[PDB]
Amino acid sequence: LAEYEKSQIKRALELGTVMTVFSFRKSTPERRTVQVIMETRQVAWSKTADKIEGFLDIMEIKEIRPGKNSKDFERAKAVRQKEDCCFTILYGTQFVLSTLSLAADSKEDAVNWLSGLKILHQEAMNASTPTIIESWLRKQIYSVDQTRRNSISLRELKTILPLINFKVSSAKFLKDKFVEIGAHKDELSFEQFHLFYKKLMFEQQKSILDEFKKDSSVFILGNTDRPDASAVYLHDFQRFLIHEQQEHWAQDLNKVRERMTKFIDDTMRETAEPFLFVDEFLTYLFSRENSIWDEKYDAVDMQDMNNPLSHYWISSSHNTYLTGDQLRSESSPEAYIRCLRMGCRCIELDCWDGPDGKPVIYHGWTRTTKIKFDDVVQAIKDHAFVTSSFPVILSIEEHCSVEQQRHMAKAFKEVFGDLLLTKPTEASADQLPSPSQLREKIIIKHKKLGPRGDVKQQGELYMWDSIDQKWTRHYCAIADAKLSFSDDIEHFGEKWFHKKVEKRTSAEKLLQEYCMETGGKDGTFLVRESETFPNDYTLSFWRSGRVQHCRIRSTMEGGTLKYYLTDNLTFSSIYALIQHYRETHLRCAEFELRLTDPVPNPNPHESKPWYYDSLSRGEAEDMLMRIPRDGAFLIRKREGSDSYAITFRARGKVKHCRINRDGRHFVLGTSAYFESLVELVSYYEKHSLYRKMRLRYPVTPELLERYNMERDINSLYELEKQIIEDNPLGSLCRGILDLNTYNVVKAPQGKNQKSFVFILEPKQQGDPPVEFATDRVEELFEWFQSIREITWKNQSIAIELSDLVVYCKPTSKTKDNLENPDFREIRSFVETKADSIIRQKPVDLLKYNQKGLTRVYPKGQRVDSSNYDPFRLWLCGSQMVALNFQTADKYMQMNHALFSLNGRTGYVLQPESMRTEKYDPMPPESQRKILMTLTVKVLGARHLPKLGRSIACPFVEVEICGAEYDNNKFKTTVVNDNGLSPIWAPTQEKVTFEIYDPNLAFLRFVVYEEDMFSDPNFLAHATYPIKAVKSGFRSVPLKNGYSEDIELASLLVFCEMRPVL
């Protein structure tokens, strides 16, 4: 397409168009105008032009599809729109892709939308770092005010600075910086903001550039590293690339010129020698251009795809249809789609019985929802080979009847056509084919016919807790005569009313302080109680730069009260006056003024029952000991100190925390600011303070009496980890109780306002009952009988589908023995059994692997969808290691690192050395030998994300993911409250990692932060195969938990790989 057509399409997109938007939250779809913003690179859908409502980062668009094949388009209202008109964007950094579904009025308009979208996405992923830096700055500016203005104020800048995860040092250096940039009068045009931003990080972390200076060798930078802007010249930059970076393509000068021209991306900079500013240089060292990842491994290396399939680590997943935990998660085809587009080449289908006759998929004997099989197989067909043409392997755990798998195989054939594999590629071959030979083919793995041609209750029940006095839905299962259940599945009262505030002087001081810290307005108000006028309120209202005071007048009329001001505007509910005075100004004989600001009392927590005015530390621990529940908390004003404190029981231990006061704000630890205590508790009820615990349960004396009434709660009591392994709920089991000791009796009419309940009636009569409740009376009676016994040709496989499987045939006839490996067999191992095999016979497992296929899947005790350690299996060559793709663990980030290679094709060829007969997978101590040393020194970071209200205090852990001998860790000194521009100690030295198996070893950079309680939390990761790590000063792009890149997140590290000679 010509450039002018592209520009026209992009301009039409920039203008925007009224397009119907669909979502699950609204039954009726909504007409919101959608427009792309080049400045922020965001597809925003909104009603009014002044303010944008929807936000959509363009670089986070993972895939755009036409048609109505999405979760949103199931409301049955999109029938009117033609199929070609409708389209859907999938975007986000989570496994579940938040979907934005639109329906264009014109099919041509939809076509331009799709084409321009694709062009915009390609430009975004191809956009240089300064352009996306400018886009992110415009993002922040658009965030501070919704009017899309290009100006930001000093106060607004102070509001935004901790949002970008950086703290204000003294609030006076900030004004000094203001002066230096030249911005004046508390105003910032976008260019001034950009220059201030550059100056900010450059001043914060110019000490890094110093190391790029170091001493002797080649002096790339001179001594011009001061704040003053300085240039890096073309010859100097190419010298740096040749020496420090050791880049081959850097040998030619034209390549270096192109790299500079693309990076800077400035029309003005057309001079013969492009120049890199020292600030631009520091940005470059933190860019995607200097990524430690080697681009050559993104290219699909064909000659490594000539080998037989048995020699390839294969991308695979365990129950991929599940988007979360194994028990109750939503199962959606988008899970399969995101896995296949992710780089996976094996997806597990636990096809089950079909209600109408058409099979469905859902994790066995759980509450996970079901999806119609035909849709699933359509999704596989449509998105199997869009990202990778290499073959996929559909592992099947069948559970349906004969006719059901007959229909399943029929649907397979009909939807797949020539794409499916139905015959061996090489009939006379004695080994598995190559992925290249199997390109654009689909293998089906499933139990075939026999050698001669012949072949617990889980539910979401209600929990009644006397302390809670409300029913809580808990997921419960029964095993080994015990029941294990998880955690939970889920004027006077207004702002402007202040009542007993001491004096008009006191109230006017309150309003004046609130104004001078923020939000000074005209005629702004405050409702107080007059110390002089009887029984009358007082609307004391600041007056356009000054504070005044007038009493809310009052007269009795019509049997009711009538408050008023000047006797002209009279009402009975204070909202009426405040609002009517806000929209239309009060007109007193002196002024026409309106109101803005309601301010809660200095001590509003007084009204909250959970506040205790003054309780000693020992007594606080006393009550906290009387309450066994986790999540209990009470706030107390510490005697003799203006500062406050909050006490909470976590993990059975009572913990005190101190809250300080900074102005009107309450600061927690040293970085989190909250206007009022009630705001703090409301926020922390929906967020986490310690570990995963949240402030759920307040502590009130009236509730404390009932606490004293009943104090027995059954709970989980590495032994606890062993108990976790035993119970069916795994780590999710929050409560476990022996059902033998409880002689159940079914409640006839239930209790506590529920339709269906049953009584436990423990054998020891003093023990308190629990009384679980169910949704269905039949479910109730089935559970009840469950505790009752707790007290006391073809046979199974369809012929056609068994004809379908031609490779990866499942055999357990040889059982634990791996003798006589033939290429057509599949081995399915549970992680425990696989680890036992690898510990007993490591060599034999590889000897099978070079000839036959091995599939390993995690055990059922991992209902939390956690992923086990796969390194040992791969080191033995276990080709199919299936992990849950919906989770985020170190091991799955390891899998992503390993399988990004080869163009995320899913097939990674094992090295020839591992495939030699002489080589042994697990080497003893004497046979192990160092073969490459690696020196890593972290230098700084950028744009480390923000988890909660508290400003992150980051420290970097660099470690070698690998076997027991390759595992080595490095921690760095924590930086205090500096996340956007953190400078780790330039004095700290470089670590030395000895590497034994460079063919499979992982360099992992992870960023954690120290919370208020000094417990590390996960911020971002970067996992890389050590064969893909480059030398020099390189910037790793940090990724969130799900291996998706975070904008501008980057760590600069000096890495040197010296092979052992």
Name the pairing type of β-strands 392-396 and 346-349.
Answer: parallel
Name the one residue in this structure whose structure tokens are 């550039």: 209
Residue 799: Cβ-neighbour burial (10 angstroms; 0-12, 13-18, 19+): middle
> Of these residues, 318, 407, 446, 1021, which one is catalytic?
318
Q: Specify whether 318 is catalytic.
A: yes
For residues 435 and 431, give the distance between their C-alpha atoms in angstroms, rounded to a whole number. Answer: 13
Residue type, 581: Y
Assign 144 to helix, strand or coil: helix
Contact predicate 373/412, CB 8 Å: no
Catalytic residue among 121, 311, 363, 896: 363
Q: What is the C-alpha end-to-end distance of the chain, expressed in Å? A: 53
Active site residue 363: yes
Q: Per-residue DSSP letters for 644-712?
A: EEEEEEETTEEEEEEEEEETTEEEETTTEEESSHHHHHHHHHSS-SBTTB---EE--HHHHHHHHH---
Q: d(Cα 393, Cα 419) in Å, to the nearest integer? A: 12
Tokens representing residue 308 in the block: 């037989």
How was this structure obtained?
cryo-EM
Place of tokens 């056609």: 800
Backbone angles phi, psi at 457, to 5 degrees: -125, 130
Q: What kind of fold does domain 932-1059 have according to CATH?
A: Immunoglobulin-like (2.60.40)
In whole angstroms, what is the distance from residue 371 CA to residue 378 CA? 12
Distance CA 819, CA 840 (A): 15
Q: Which residues make Cβ contacts (< 8 Å) with residue 689, sequence separation at least 6?
A: 648, 657, 695, 1012, 1013
Q: 389: which strand partners?
A: none
- Of 403, 492, 445, nearest in space to 854 by CA: 445
Domain 610-699 superfamily per CATH: SH2 domain (3.30.505.10)
Residue whose C-alpha is closest to residue 235's, from 253, 217, 248? 253
Tokens, residue 951: 């400003």
Q: How many angstroms separate the CA atoms of 575 and 715, rounded?
A: 48
Residue 1044: DSSP 8-state:
P
d(CA 804, CA 174): 70
Q: Look at strands 392-396 and 442-445 and give their pairing.
A: parallel
Type and span of the H or E element at 159:
helix 154-160
Question: Is 505 within 8 Å of 588 (Cβ atoms)?
Answer: no
Looking at 384-485, list the stretches that DSSP marks H as alpha helix, in order from N- to C-terminal side: 402-416
For residue 980, CA distances in Å to 170, 209, 986, 1051 come to: 17, 17, 17, 11
Euclidean distance between CA atoms 50 and 476, whole angstroms: 50
**Rounded to whole angstroms, what are the CA distances from 965 to 847, 871, 930?**
23, 12, 10
Q: Comparing C-alpha atoms, which of 838, 860, 861, 629 is closest to residue 722?
A: 861
Token code pair at residue 293: 């990842």
Joined tokens for residue 274: 């492009």
Q: What is the DSSP letter of 925?
A: T
Token pair for 717: 């009591």
**Could you tell me the strand order of the sheet in which 458-464 lies?**
458-464, 471-479, 482-488, 735-738
DSSP secondary structure letter of residue 492? T
Q: What is the 3-state secondary structure (H, E, C) of 628-653?
A: CCCCEEEEEECCCCCCEEEEEEECCE
**1053 vs 1051: CA distance, rounded Å:** 6
Contacts of 276 (CB under 8 A, 6+ apart): 231, 232, 237, 260, 263, 264, 284
Q: Which residues contact 235 (CB under 8 A, 6 or more apart)?
A: 253
What single DSSP character describes residue 414?
H
Give 506's Cβ-side CA count (13 Å radius): 14
Write the DSSP symbol of residue 920: -
- CATH class for the domain made up of 459-490+712-791: mainly beta
**Strand segments (E) across 376-438:** 392-396
* Alpha-carbon gap, residue 473 to 995, rounded angstroms: 50
Q: What's the rounded Cα separation, in Å, for the pair 948 and 1011?
A: 10
The string of DSSP letters for 191-240 reads HHHHHHHHHHHHHHHHHHHHHTT-SSS--SS-S--SSS--EE-HHHHHHH
Q: How far apart are CA 777 and CA 302, in angstroms?
A: 61
Residue 244 φ/ψ, nearest 5 degrees? -70, -45
Backbone angles phi and psi of 259, in degrees to 5: -65, -45
Tokens coding 723: 């108990």
Could you give the count of Cα atoms lying within 13 Å of 21 in the half-sphere of its Cβ?
A: 21
From the CB of residue 681, how many other CB atoms can be counted at a distance below 10 Å?
19
Coil, helix or strand at residue 915: helix
**Contact status, residue 390 vs residue 909, Cβ threshold 8 Å:** no
The DSSP output letter for 1005 is: E
3-state secondary structure of 746: coil
SS3 per-residue string spanning 828-881: EEEHHHHHHHHHHCHHHHHHHHCCCEEEEECCCCCCCCCCCCCHHHHHCCCCEE
Dig out the tokens for 422 from the structure.
């139905």
Longest dimension (CA), the chain: 106
d(Cα 97, Cα 91) in Å, to the nearest integer? 6
Separation between Cα atoms, residue 734 and residue 714, nearest integer Å: 9
Domain over 3-126 is classified CATH 3.40.50.720: no
Q: What is the DSSP string of 65-89?
A: EETT-SSSTTSS-TTSS-TTTEEEE
Sign of the torsion formed by the C-alpha atoms of 695, 696, 700 and 706 = negative
As a whole number of angstroms, the distance between CA 934 and CA 936 comes to 6
Among 864, 890, 1042, which residue's Cα sits nearest to residue 329? 864
Residue 137 CB neighbours (<10 A): 19
Give whole-number Cα distances, 314 to 245, 317, 865, 896, in Å: 33, 10, 20, 12
CA distances from 465 to 44, 692, 710, 713, 729 (A): 46, 22, 10, 9, 21
Give the pair of three-digit tokens for residue 75. 């409301």
The helix (run of H) or strand (run of E) holding residue 810 is strand 809-810
Token duo for residue 833 = 């059994």
**CA dihedral for 259, 261, 262, 265, sign (positive or negative):** positive
In angstroms, rounded to a whole number, what is the distance separating the alpha carbons of residues 689 and 1012? 8
Site of tokens 């397979």: 412
Enter the CATH code of domain 504-593. Answer: 3.30.505.10
CATH superfamily of 302-454+796-911: Phosphatidylinositol (PI) phosphodiesterase (3.20.20.190)
